[PDB]
Structure 1
């Protein structure tokens, strides 16, 4: 919030790893959604 807390290096690396996992999961989800949209276009044109 307003006051800055102190975070240890272990906590910081763990938080960064969690954020990286979150973003890679979002990327995989977006890739599967792209696959679904592409399949929709292909079977609409077929």
Structure 2
């Protein structure tokens, strides 16, 4: 949003891991297509 919500290092690492897993799933779906 407008106000930047501060997160921890572990929460940011978990968000980056979830984004990488979503990108890997999108790449696997694109490869299957």
TM-score, L = length of structure 2 = 0.86
Deviation of the 1:18 alpha carbon: 0.1
RMSD: 5.8
Moved over 2 A (4+): none
Instruction: Provide structure 1 residue ranges, at least 5 long, that are not aligned to the other structure.
Output: 31-43
- Whole-Å separation in 1 of the counterparts to 2:21 and 2:14: 11
How many residues end up aligned between the 2 structures? 33
Deviation of the 1:45 alpha carbon: 20
TM-score, L = length of structure 1 = 0.63
Instruction: Provide structure 2 residue ranges, at least 5 long, that are not aligned to the other structure.
Output: none
